[PDB]
Design a protein around this nucleic acid. Structure first.
Lengths: 136, 141, 94, 38
RNA sequence: AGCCAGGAUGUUGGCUUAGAAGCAGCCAUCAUUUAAAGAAAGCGUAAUAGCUCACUGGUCGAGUCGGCCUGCGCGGAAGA
């Protein structure tokens, strides 16, 4: 599980998730798993999907996780009233918008990249698509 | 031979007679005789040289048991008779386990012409060196 | 070797461009050299199947606008974020 | 048979048929591949 | 797409081969007469074997195959 090594403040406000994404082209690799839905992704979903990919295209290839969590999500325990402070940091999510290339892959044929990205897009909560490295 | 009518191919190293541990009733399930691997088969084995299994066609007729003629010496123990260690291949091609001189394969390939596919010497030369590719046997050029 | 038939955009801004992409076209511009920049509207499907090739981004293109021919080269393409379609293309004269 | 909400062709003999508004997977090779309700 | 034909040899390739002789195993994964063929893609064995196919010929006489972008729909869908 991914999590920043050392923050600056422990608890972040909710804020909103509007507009489109910045990481949009397949930059590092050759094939990409790009988001279409909005959503947000916990570190467990990123790890689950990465294990599905790494298993699927065996220890050949090279995989880039282009998103990183760095946003702490706090929850209140059970049978605790409202108020009395902000909750506790339970997990860490990355906020996703439509357009984020969530993962990249290189060093495989395209048909294995289709296969691993299908296998791993079923571990994520957002609708997802397959993209290739377009040249300009 | 004909349509498949009770002929199979099975035994182990035929320096001895009638292998009881390895196969046994595998040569007794069909109409193939138990006795005709023991005396007459070794009578037809001593015509060239012993110490080789023979995958052979045994066409069981309405005769006593059948009639048999051994035809070709197979290339498994012919490519194991001088190859390297006596244990086996395992993973033979990713390293250098065996090595075979190609002149003796040119003369054995020049001998064997019945149970092959080829009409030229060079056409069937590297086929048996394809069996050297099988057990990882590095040919000495 | 590519011939891309174009028209001149009499309207511009985000209203007119988004109206222009719902009608299965997309805006574009031809700038470079000493001339004024030229706002251009392009059919979408022709240019999308055309840019699926690699030679679209390397070879000199020819854009036919008002019965002229401007030999341009595809400078920079804005693509839609999550759909296989185009927002806009910058064409530098050549 | 298997009532699932994803019905798929598990084999090359499996075959998707819609009967009575219901998607089904009829196989001839293996009857374990018989499925319903996709 | 149907229908009529062919689809092998070293190849028991050695296996920890107790039986694997393409079939509970791993490395290999070659080369040829040949339009064409995998040391076997599916089943299958006490065990070879048994078939079908991957590919090619004939019959057939006009479309067919699979992706993409989309509109509307189907399933997923159980409560007093």
């Amino acid at each position: 599980m991914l999590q920043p090594k050392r923050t600056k403040f422990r608890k972040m406000h909710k804020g909103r998730n509007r507009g489109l994404a910045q990481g949009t082209d397949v930059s590092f690799g050759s094939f990409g798993l790009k988001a279409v839905g909005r959503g947000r992704l916990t570190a467990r979903q990123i790890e689950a999907a990465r294990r599905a990919m790494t298993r699927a295209v065996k220890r050949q290839g090279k995989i880039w996780i282009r998103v990183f969590p760095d946003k702490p999500i706090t929850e209140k325990p059970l049978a605790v009233r409202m108020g009395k402070g902000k909750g506790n940091v339970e997990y860490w999510v990355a906020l996703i918008q439509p357009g984020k290339v969530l993962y990249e892959m290189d060093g495989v044929p395209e048909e294995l990249a289709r296969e691993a990205f299908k296998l791993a897009a079923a571990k994520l909560p957002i609708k997802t698509t397959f993209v290739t490295k377009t040249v300009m | 031979a004909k349509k498949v009518q009770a002929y199979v191919k099975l035994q182990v190293a035929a320096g001895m007679a009638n292998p009881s541990p390895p196969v046994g009733p595998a040569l007794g399930q069909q109409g193939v005789n138990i006795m005709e691997f023991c005396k007459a088969f070794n009578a037809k084995t001593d015509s060239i040289e012993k110490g080789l299994p023979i995958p052979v066609v045994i066409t069981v007729y309405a005769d006593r048991s059948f009639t048999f003629v051994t035809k070709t010496p197979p290339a498994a123990v012919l490519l194991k008779k001088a190859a390297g260690i006596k244990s086996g291949s395992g993973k033979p091609n990713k390293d250098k386990v065996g090595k075979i001189s190609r002149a003796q394969l040119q003369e054995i390939a020049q001998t064997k012409a019945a149970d092959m596919t080829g009409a030229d010497i060079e056409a069937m030369t590297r086929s048996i060196e394809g069996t050297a590719r099988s057990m990882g046997l590095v040919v000495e050029d | 070797m590519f011939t891309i038939n174009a028209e001149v955009r009499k309207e511009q801004g985000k209203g007119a461009s988004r109206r222009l992409r719902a009608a299965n076209k997309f805006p574009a511009i031809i700038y470079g050299g000493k001339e004024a920049p030229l706002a251009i509207e392009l059919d979408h499907d022709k240019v999308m199947n055309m840019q699926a090739k690699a030679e679209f981004y390397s070879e000199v293109l020819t854009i036919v606008v008002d019965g002229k021919e401007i030999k341009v080269k595809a400078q920079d393409v804005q693509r839609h974020p999550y759909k296989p379609k185009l927002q806009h293309i910058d064409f530098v004269r050549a | 048979m298997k009532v699932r909400a994803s019905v798929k062709k598990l084999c090359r003999n499996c075959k998707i048929v819609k009967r009575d508004g219901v998607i089904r997977v009829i196989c001839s090779a293996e009857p374990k591949h018989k499925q319903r309700q996709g």
